[PDB]
Amino acid sequence: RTLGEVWKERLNQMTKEEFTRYRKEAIIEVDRSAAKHARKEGNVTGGHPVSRGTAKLRWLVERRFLEPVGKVIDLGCGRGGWCYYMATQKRVQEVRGYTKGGPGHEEPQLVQSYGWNIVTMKSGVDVFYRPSECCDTLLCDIGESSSSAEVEEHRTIRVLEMVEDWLHRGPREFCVKVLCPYMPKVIEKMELLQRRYGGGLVRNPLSRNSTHEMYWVSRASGNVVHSVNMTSQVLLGRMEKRTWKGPQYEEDVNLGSGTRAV
């Protein structure tokens, strides 16, 4: 049994109240309050991000785990927090996103933060059937969670196979969400995917403890197994913390407004 597995066995035996407590413990969280009430007054020029997403992506680019350049393609962009954010990046001159859409899933939200003009979001597109395009930096935040790990291991290997095909950039940029990185199939796939496209797994501190996801980013490295086991330790440790502090709230990002020339 991998340490990630005991982590799932444990998680699933918790209660609603202990569950809801565990997930947001000691993690970093942004204050959505402002954006929430900006949406109501129909304020699409406040510079407010459309989701908790953008903030997650920023934390990553800001540590230099990647450097978004040229045409940007986003897989499963939902509201568009990764797209609106990229449109505020120096070397990015076009953002394109694709999402499921339809009942149950989100629909891209059209706002006017800094650079919106450069982004095009198309909904009603199931990425697992869509043939590949050319992009300088690719992104993907897909991974439908389940109470079963065998199931996560699959939905992941699928995504990974869906990604490797879009991977025909050059010494390019990418950030891809890995739903279940602890099951052997995903570790064998990663190990190999690493040998071809470099990069590495990264646990994003903005994630909730109720998920073992990690981000394979082009500008990172490190023995995969090692990378995923360290995290498991963390998630396992946050369950037995005698003293419980809630989540730490950092300020939510502000993209600005207006358009970017030409």
Ligand X SMILES: Nc1ncnc2c1ncn2[C@@H]1O[C@H](CSCC[C@H](N)C(=O)O)[C@@H](O)[C@H]1O
- Cβ-based nearer residue to ligand X, 17 or 62: 62
The yes or no reply on residue 76 touching ligand X (CB under 6 A) is: yes
Strand 28-30 vs strand 137-140: parallel, antiparallel, or unpaired?
A: unpaired
**x/- binding map, residues 176-215, to ligand X, per CB under 6 A?**
----------------------------------------
Instruction: Give the one residue of 30, 46, 51, 166 binding ligand X; rule: CB under 6 A.
Output: 51
Interface pick for ligand X out of 46, 53, 68, 199 (rule CB under 6 A): 53
Q: Which of 9, 18, 31, 126 binds ligand X (CB under 6 A)?
A: 126
Q: Which of the residues 74, 136, 141, 153 is marked catalytic?
A: 141
- Give the 3-state DSSP-derived string for the chain, with helices as H, strands as E and coil as C: CCHHHHHHHHHCCCCHHHHHHHHCCCCEEECCHHHHHHHHCCCCCCCCCCCCHHHHHHHHHCCCCCCCCCEEEEECCCCCHHHHHHCCCCCCCEEEEECCCCCCCCCCCCCCCCCHHHEEEECCCCCCCCCCCCCCEEEECCCCCCCCHHHHHHHHHHHHHHHHHHCCCCCCEEEEEECCCCCHHHHHHHHHHHHHHCCECCCCCCCCCCCCCEEEECCCCCCHHHHHHHHHHHHHHCCCCCCCCCCEEECCCCCCCCCCCC
Residues 136-155 that bind ligand X (CB under 6 A): 141-142, 144
**99 or 204, CB closer to ligand X?**
99
Among the listed residues 82, 116, 166, 182, the single contact to ligand X using CB under 6 A: 82
- Interface segment toward ligand X; rule CB under 6 A; list 26-34, 50-58, 62-70, 196-204: 50-58
CB atoms within 10 A of CB 134: 12
Q: Rounded to whole angstroms, what are the CA distances from 211 to 4, 37, 69, 96, 219?
A: 10, 28, 29, 27, 23
105 interacts with ligand X by CB under 6 A: yes
Task: Tell me how many residues contact ligand X (CB under 6 A).
Answer: 20
Least distance between ligand X and beta carbon 91 (Å): 20
Selected catalytic residue, list 74, 136, 177, 189: 177
Cβ contacts of 89 within 8 Å, gap of 6 or more: 61, 68
User: 40 catalytic, yes or no?
Assistant: no
217 is a site residue for ligand X (CB under 6 A): no
Q: Residues forming the annotated binding site? A: 51, 81-82, 99-100, 106, 126-127, 141-142, 215
Q: Which is nearer to ligand X, 77 or 138 (CB)?
A: 77
Active site residue: 136, 152, 153, 213, which one? Answer: 213
Active site annotation includes 213: yes
Q: Which residues of this protein are in contact with ligand X, per CB under 6 A?
A: 51, 53-54, 76-82, 99-100, 105-106, 126-128, 141-142, 144
Catalytic positions: 56, 141, 177, 213
